[PDB]
Design a protein around this ligand. Structure first.
Ligand SMILES: COC1(CCN)CCN(c2nccc(Nc3cc4c(cn3)nc(C)n4C(C)C)n2)CC1
Length: 300
């Protein structure tokens, strides 16, 4: 019927990696910055460690791990392994610059049109990949795109992915709990809005109950100051009522790539082109001995 999922789930020993500090605490548990020093491999791999105990919640993290261990794409966050301790810990790639949402807020004054449009293209590539794998994310948002470097982002959070975040959802989903790749497009639209507004809250003030009807009336998020009509129209097409009228991810990749070739023609930003964000060709950008990025460390 469907193809066998031959992904390898890697079980890692607790003693093979060390927690360094905390990166975030929530209801789910807590995420640590850490290092993974596998076997006798002569490599340190920077990792994020997500740890939880109540039986019906352990199933949800293992569900996330299932999906996260099954993806392999440059614009999606893969699971490196799990560690079975009293708690259960997901080991993931360290994405040193955090979520894109906070990144746009904290670095607004150095974010030019090239970065924004390239981020849009990369998220669309990620999502298109998830579509090839017949996977529906169901929670795409700026908060769930992570920054490996300012020039490289990746989609995460498979805690809702299958084969509630109201202000990012398609209408069909809010009212009928229907979810498709095209419902992910809607959320893509909202995500891009967040980026083009440098991290503004969508429908800030409106309570989620009112949102369903607001959308029913034909209201949509406003045209961000920096957005040419070319870019805004793309957002708006992602918010059509007819799911099939919305763009496909494959087209979103194309449209944003064209615009990324002449960025200042599609986003208008004061001081654009004389802005500097950290690069792997900078000083102090990176024990340091034998550090290897997860993306360059392959197989057991
Ligand atoms: C807590 O789980 C998440 C959100 C679920 N709603 C989903 C999994 N996620 C994740 N996925 C893959 C890699 C990764 N690494 C990662 C996450 C980081 C990070 C560095 N690296 N710095 C910060 C501040 N954070 C997050 C807590 C947002 N983190 C971490 C956040």
């Amino acid at each position: 019927g469907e193809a066998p999922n031959q992904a390898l789930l890697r079980i890692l020993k607790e003693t093979e990696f060390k927690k360094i500090k905390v990166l975030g605490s929530g209801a789910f548990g807590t995420v640590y910055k850490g290092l993974w020093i596998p076997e006798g491999e002569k490599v340190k791999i920077p990792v994020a460690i997500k740890e939880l105990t109540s039986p019906k919640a352990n199933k949800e993290i293992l569900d996330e791990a299932y999906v996260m261990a099954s993806v392999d794409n440059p614009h999606v966050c893969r699971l490196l392994g799990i560690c079975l301790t009293s708690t259960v810990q997901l080991i993931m790639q360290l994405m040193p610059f955090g979520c894109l949402l906070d990144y746009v807020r904290e670095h607004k004054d150095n974010i030019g049109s090239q970065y924004l449009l390239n981020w849009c293209v990369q998220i669309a590539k990620g999502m298109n990949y998830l579509e090839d794998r017949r996977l529906v994310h169901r929670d795409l948002a700026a908060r769930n795109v992570l920054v490996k470097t300012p020039q490289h982002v990746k989609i995460t959070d498979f805690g809702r992915a299958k084969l509630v975040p109201i202000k990012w959802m398609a209408l069909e989903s809010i009212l009928h709990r229907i979810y498709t790749h095209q419902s992910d497009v809607w959320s893509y639209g909202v995500t891009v809005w967040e980026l083009m507004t440098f991290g503004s809250k969508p429908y800030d003030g409106i309570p989620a109950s009112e949102i369903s009807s607001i959308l029913e009336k034909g209201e949509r998020l406003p045209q961000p100051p920096i957005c040419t009509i070319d870019v805004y129209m793309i957002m708006v097409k992602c918010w059509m009522i007819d799911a099939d009228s919305r763009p496909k991810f494959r087209e979103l990749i194309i449209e944003f790539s064209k615009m990324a070739r002449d960025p200042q023609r599609y986003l208008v930003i004061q001081g654009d082109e004389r802005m500097h964000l950290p690069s792997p060709t900078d000083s102090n950008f990176y024990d340091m001995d034998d550090v290897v990025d997860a993306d360059e460390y392959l197989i057991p």
